[PDB]
């Protein structure tokens, strides 16, 4: 399938490792040239090595990025304009008694973090995109994690209802039990077994398997796609 | 229908007028003894005089207080813990190209509105409700508002999963179109014609129609119900 | 709290056990004059003489009738006007799929066929004949007992969640046609609420998996938030309020009443 | 993007004209081999030979088949097995409720009975169908066109979305089950999209309402947030993906396909 995205300028957050690592993968083999970012320089730099040099052809912009930090993402996108003088894609990816015990300073803490974190990088966006004609933004989207990821959901339909009318199109993808290093790292922190168990699929997704999502929805095939948080889950959502 | 209420100790905010002060007036009906408050001292004194006289047989605390402010929260469920050595009820009742036109400042600001003023003044409540083992939190409930909304909304699921072992249920309600002083406000800020248009009963609801169901949640009969969000519309969510 | 129900007539259906007859008990309570039905004779008869001795102030009319049937559903409702002359509230409450079988491609059209022709016909077709009665009269209330299934469907439940998510979105749609006329149109969604048909599941269930009631119970608990299961009476007091003069403004939605089941 | 697609055997039910046809269009652009069916003869020969001549390296199979009956349908995927010897794909499409009568009441039993008996209980046969087939292979990709109904019910559309959120329903539980298999079973809903139907549809609501179908089209426009029709490419696109290899971690899943009409 012909995803109409030669030459298509890619910003893909978090793209150092795992989803956001692949996703970036992928759309360099649909023809985009990337921007990847990352805050550890180290793990981005081996990242960049990677895609360079299996996709030679493409450009890649790697800046290292804190985009939870307001200055960092103004900069993250100012350096991506000077640098391709468009930005096509936005994939934003980046880091999400027991209720009683959260203070006001714990609530407004992940505020700043990833729910101010992707409103403000698509804010930053849209007139660029609105001026292009052409966007695509991806949210990839746990009391806390619940609030802001409902949070995001509703802002991804309103923001998508006001810039449809501009081609600029944004959706969000929600991960089930994807095998990225977060979570080989945070069930060594067998208890799999029992994850299996509760994935109709029997199975935990790839990297791959998302990514391919996220890349269809950021192309010109799904030009009529707006507004909406798909699951991608093996079946969880069942 | 006896709702169990008599005795029962509820905090209304927001209740000197409209949906918040017919609670106010409901509840006392019930035989609930009342904390009503509000920021405007001479709203609050007149809606506090019309409880004090339909309802003699009743206690009402009258405390001025701005729900969004952490100091003035926390003072007015001490305040109410003084008074009446319990707090059965809290009804959470205070207010709420475009999008790429809001700062970050923005939106921080309506986080630390309503979202995290209910998120508080819940928090707050908690060890009081468990403690009695008698607990009813009923959330009344436009981007910056429909994100604020649906963080409100899985809030409540989360929450309620979390203190339903201790019969402190929590639910919200979500108006649809109530003749509120706010409403006779923002529609002469006729016009009214084509809201009623849009209401399936070709009708404004009442805030005493609004009230009836708050009150049912916060009673004993309710006692099954938790973590719902139910509109109260007048049919605009067909 | 007063709902204002003082001599509305009230139509349940499949009210001699269970959830039915425990609205049936409240609408009364509330001053109803009721009209309640079953398709076994001797169990109507038993709810009725229990009905009839707790509150012989009200009009009760028992009917044999099986509101799966059009010929029954048709009666009934005609039987109920030649007695009380209006109907003021339905409760469409009635059997729904069987527990037997959930492996898909293992039921037949037929096992379909059935299933659409029991509840799921039943509470659309007796809806269809209470609205032109509320509807002349600008005063209408029904409230629908369908259950969680048709939100989130369960392994026991294809066929149920099915026929239930049907009826939810037929809620919403028949609610926007007659809310103008008073006539308002909710459902309600039980999730485990303790009724003979609960208990019959549990016996059978256990029996199925090599196991007791007893830990069948124990494993749907761990699941309900609240770590109990409903009463008909908590379950009834939602539908009492449905159905009155107090909900006023309330229609097309669906409500669980689940111990916090939806939110976990 | 490479699909995995080459050499699938594909069946798309109503496959002689709009979101149907343009599915088959671009399976077999994929490397499909495909079965088409239709009712109509005529037109369903137009489509084989259009499709035959602009994709002659793939097999394409025709067959005249109404797959609203059960006869047709069995038959239908026999013919199928015995041409290919396997189905890996299944899109359900079929003519849904008719756009004639929406005011409730005024729906007969009989009304509904074919609601049921068409689309409804369709896509759940041949669910049923093809589900051994592609649990004894483990591989199977089966999407349900549905329609937005189903999600936000419409003034024109009651039975329709009473149907669709069956299907939404019955969607999510045949997806739990055949999960393991790698047989994925997801459904769109598509909005506004520009076929002979919806042209058909607008047609006769200008006539019924006393307007143009022109000021029709400007309407739903104005509610469309991409303030445009959709085309059948441009849904066959997410058919088809969904259809694929690269769809492999997604199931039980109902997508809108719609221009932002869902979240207006
Ligand atoms: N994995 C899963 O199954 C699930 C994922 N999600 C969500 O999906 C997204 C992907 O998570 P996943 O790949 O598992 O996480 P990982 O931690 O495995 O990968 C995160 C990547 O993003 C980078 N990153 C993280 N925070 C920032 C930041 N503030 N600024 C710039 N770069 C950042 C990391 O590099 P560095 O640390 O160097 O910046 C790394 O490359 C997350 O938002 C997560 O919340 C949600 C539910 C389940
Ligand atoms: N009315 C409607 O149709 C709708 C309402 N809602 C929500 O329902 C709730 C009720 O609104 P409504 O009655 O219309 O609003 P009104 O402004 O009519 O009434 C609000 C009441 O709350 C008080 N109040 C407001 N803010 C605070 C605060 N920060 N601290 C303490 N008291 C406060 C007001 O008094 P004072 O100003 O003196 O404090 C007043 O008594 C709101 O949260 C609103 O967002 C949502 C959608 C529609
Ligand atoms: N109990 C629960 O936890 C749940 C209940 N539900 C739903 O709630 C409703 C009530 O269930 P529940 O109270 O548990 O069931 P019970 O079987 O315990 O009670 C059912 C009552 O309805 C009568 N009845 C059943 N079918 C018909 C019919 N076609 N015509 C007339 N009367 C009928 C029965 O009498 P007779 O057999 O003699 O007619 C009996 O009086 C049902 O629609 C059920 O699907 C859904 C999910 C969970
Ligand atoms: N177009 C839209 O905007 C919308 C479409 N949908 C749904 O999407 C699907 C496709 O609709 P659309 O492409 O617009 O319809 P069209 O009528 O334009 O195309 C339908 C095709 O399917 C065939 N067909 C219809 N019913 C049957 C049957 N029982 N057996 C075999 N073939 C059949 C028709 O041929 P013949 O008549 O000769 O069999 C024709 O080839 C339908 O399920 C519809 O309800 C839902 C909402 C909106
Ligand atoms: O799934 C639902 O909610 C149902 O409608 C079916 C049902 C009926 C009775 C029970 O005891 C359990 C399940
Ligand atoms: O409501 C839906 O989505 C449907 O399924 C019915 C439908 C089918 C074709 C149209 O052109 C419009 C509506």
Known sequence: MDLGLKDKVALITGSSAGIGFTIAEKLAEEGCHLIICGRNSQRLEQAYQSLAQAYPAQQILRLVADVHQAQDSEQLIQDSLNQYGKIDILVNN???????????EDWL???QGKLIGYIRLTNL????MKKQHWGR????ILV??????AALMNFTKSVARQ????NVLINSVNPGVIDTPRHREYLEILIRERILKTIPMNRIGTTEEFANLVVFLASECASYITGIT???????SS
Chains 1, 2 share one sequence.
């Open 163 to 166: 810039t449809a009318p501009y």
């Open 109 to 111: 803490n992940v505020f």
């Open 125 to 128: 966006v849209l007139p660029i």
């Open 94 to 104: 980046s880091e999400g008694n027991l209720i009683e015990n959260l203070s006001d």
């Open 144 to 149: 806390k994690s619940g609030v802001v990821n």
């Open 230 to 236: 798909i699951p991608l889950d093996g079946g969880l």
């Open 137 to 140: 933004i991806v949210n990839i």
